[PDB]
Curated annotation (Swiss-Prot), chain A:
The 26S proteasome is involved in the ATP-dependent degradation of ubiquitinated proteins. The regulatory (or ATPase) complex confers ATP dependency and substrate specificity to the 26S complex. It comes from Saccharomyces cerevisiae (strain ATCC 204508 / S288c). It is found in: Cytoplasm; Nucleus. Disulfide bonds: none annotated. N-acetylated by NAT1. May form a homodimer or a heterodimer with a related family member. Interacts with OLA1, TMA17, and UBR1. This is 26S proteasome regulatory subunit 8 homolog. Present with 4700 molecules/cell in log phase SD medium. It comes from the Eukaryota. Coiled coil: none annotated. Belongs to the AAA ATPase family.
Curated annotation (Swiss-Prot), chain B:
One of its GO terms (molecular function) is structural molecule activity. It comes from Saccharomyces cerevisiae (strain ATCC 204508 / S288c). The lineage of its organism: Eukaryota, Fungi, Dikarya, Ascomycota, Saccharomycotina. Keywords: Nucleus, Phosphoprotein, Proteasome, TPR repeat. The 26S proteasome is composed of a core protease, known as the 20S proteasome, capped at one or both ends by the 19S regulatory complex (RC). The RC is composed of at least 18 different subunits in two subcomplexes, the base and the lid, which form the portions proximal and distal to the 20S proteolytic core, respectively. Component of the lid subcomplex of the 19S RC. It comes from the Eukaryota. The keyword Phosphoprotein applies. Present with 51900 molecules/cell in log phase SD medium. TPR repeats lie at residues 88-121. GO terms for biological process: proteasome-mediated ubiquitin-dependent protein catabolic process; ubiquitin-dependent protein catabolic process. Component of the 19S cap proteasome complex which acts as a regulatory subunit of the 26S proteasome, involved in the ATP-dependent degradation of ubiquitinated proteins. SUPFAM superfamilies: TPR-like (SSF48452), Winged helix' DNA-binding domain (SSF46785). This is 26S proteasome regulatory subunit RPN7. The gene is RPN7.
From Swiss-Prot, chain C:
The chain holds residues 327 to 380 of 434 of the full protein. The gene is RPN6. Belongs to the proteasome subunit S9 family. Present with 16800 molecules/cell in log phase SD medium. This is 26S proteasome regulatory subunit RPN6. Component of the lid subcomplex of the 19S proteasome regulatory particle complex (also named PA700 complex). The 26S proteasome consists of a 20S proteasome core and two 19S regulatory subunits. It comes from Saccharomyces cerevisiae (strain ATCC 204508 / S288c).
Curated annotation (Swiss-Prot), chain E:
This is 26S proteasome complex subunit SEM1. One of its GO terms (cellular component) is proteasome storage granule. Keywords: Acetylation, Phosphoprotein, Proteasome, Transcription. GO terms for biological process: double-strand break repair via homologous recombination; filamentous growth; maintenance of DNA trinucleotide repeats; mRNA export from nucleus; positive regulation of transcription by RNA polymerase II; proteasome assembly; proteasome-mediated ubiquitin-dependent protein catabolic process; regulation of cell cycle. The chain holds residues 17 to 89 of 89 of the full protein. Versatile protein that might stabilize multiple protein complexes involved in diverse pathways. Subunit of the 26S proteasome which plays a role in ubiquitin-dependent proteolysis. Also associates with the TREX-2 complex that is required for transcription-coupled mRNA export, and the COP9 signalosome, which is involved in deneddylation. Belongs to the DSS1/SEM1 family.
Amino acid sequence: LRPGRIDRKIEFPPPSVAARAEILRIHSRKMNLTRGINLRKVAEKMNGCSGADVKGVCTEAGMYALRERRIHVTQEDFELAVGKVMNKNQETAI
Amino acid sequence: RVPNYEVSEKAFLLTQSKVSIEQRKEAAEFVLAKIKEEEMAPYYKYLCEEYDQELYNELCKKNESKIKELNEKIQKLEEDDEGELEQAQAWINLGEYYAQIGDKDNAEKTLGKSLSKAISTGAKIDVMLTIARLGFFYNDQLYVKEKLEAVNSMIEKGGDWERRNRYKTYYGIHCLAVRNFKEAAKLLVDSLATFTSIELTSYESIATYASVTGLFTLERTDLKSKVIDSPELLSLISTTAALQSISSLTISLYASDYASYFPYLLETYANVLIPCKYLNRHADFFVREMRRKVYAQLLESYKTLSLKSMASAFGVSVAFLDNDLGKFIPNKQLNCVIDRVNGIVETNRPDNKNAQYHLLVKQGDGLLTKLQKYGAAVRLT
Amino acid sequence: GDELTRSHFNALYDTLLESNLCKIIEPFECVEISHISKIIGLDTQQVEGKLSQM
Amino acid sequence: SLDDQIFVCEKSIEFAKREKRVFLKHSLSIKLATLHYQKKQYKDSLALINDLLREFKKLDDKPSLVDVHLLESKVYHKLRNLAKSKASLTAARTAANSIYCPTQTVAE
Amino acid sequence: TKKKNEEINKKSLEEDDEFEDFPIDTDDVEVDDDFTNELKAELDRYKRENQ
């Protein structure tokens, strides 16, 4: 922590809401397409602090759809996925 | 795209004289308006024999209107700057019209140009499928087959999950179309679970097909789980007539009603197997199996039966039953004989040691011939 | 009047039938179906048909 | 009986969506699905819920719309698909996470 | 190119091919039992009623 001894220091900001949307997009393609495009709806709702939070939505969305055996990823699936994740984060960070 | 199948299915009932004259002419009323409306003369020429020149002036007008519209539209959108995408969409649009009049020849051309141009990867997969749809319209089995390979070539490169759902249903129809039902029953019931429809034949069709194919292929225990206790089929109830007839035949077999079983076979043949174009081919093939099945179960349960007990349960006479039984016995799926003299039906049903011996030795003969075949050539060389 | 009652009572029939049956076929081989029908208490014909399912 | 119930429901619903505003309206559609159910018209009842459902998810936060979700389960119970009686029981539960519901809503 | 002497000479003794002479001159076995069944059912039913 003498300066120019570690010659570069790099901070990564906490993600932007646009930055978030790009992460959300690509993992959804791996699953099945979000019907009625609700990829935006998540980003409008909250900005994550990390890419892990984003991943958590994905896994969960695909989990309600799994149970059902209906590959479709519906608005109903996304809405559950988000709130469930959102609670969890708050109960650690209070 | 959508109407092309609607027409032909109606037209089929008009074609056949097997159908009742009342039903025939119901179909005649319905189809006639749409011939004129969707301008269906190239396809209609075949069927008309097979069962106005205004239709044509209309064709040619339409041909030219629709033909010209679309032509100069592209001439417009070559100019207007976006060389990959807007020509592509305009070329698709020519093909939309071709597909409308049921001329597949001209469809292929315009959608060819569409493909050349490099556009959205999803879009291409949609086009390939549309060409495979035209194989169902003509109901040429050979047309559907070749095309569905091109679709399967691009699906997994595309890694589209969405149009991957469509693949199932289309490939259902190829295996349905063909005799071999072993691949068909699996495919068509999976598509009741996941339906994605973008310009696609009704959901009703899928129900009708699952039920038949369920019956033919599956054993007793798996029939209950997958067909009888299907939630979709039950939730949709029996609404349509075609669906209704097959449902009654299914319940009775499982509830082991024997009296109404044989009347439902007659019913199913009148109202399910013959209206369908794809399972018209397999009407004979389906029934022969199902009559063997009621018996095959019954003989499992009984060392001996009388002729009168066997016959009477079903509601057919002793003379009729005896005759039907000698037809089925040399295929060796019933493994029983009829003692004329004692009047009993004795059941051989061998699952002895000697039985299992036969099955492995027939596999070994197949391997024996091949060894000789490869060896003898290669030694001479 | 009770649909739910009627369904489980269809099942009961079969389960308690089995419990009876497992006892019956142990000390017998080639027992007359007339004799079996007395033990269970069911009709002769009715016995026949149920076993065909079992 | 049959006659009186259906006609009464018709006249009342019509009066109450062209005079009275959208609030009252979506309520009488719940009643109507319930009242169809008792006649054994279940196709009718399921389509009533479909008419509502999307526009009233937006609005779901009410105990009266928790009941829409309870009712859906029952529709699917009697048509004998227990995949989707199961699913809508779940739906009800999410909107009924607060356990502070009417005693009658809890009992159901 | 090695078998070719032999295959052509062999063929000559059959003479021609038969296969193209043929058009110039001129439920694999079973029959669909639904038709039969139809008739029979009617016939049963009568006797059954009057029994």
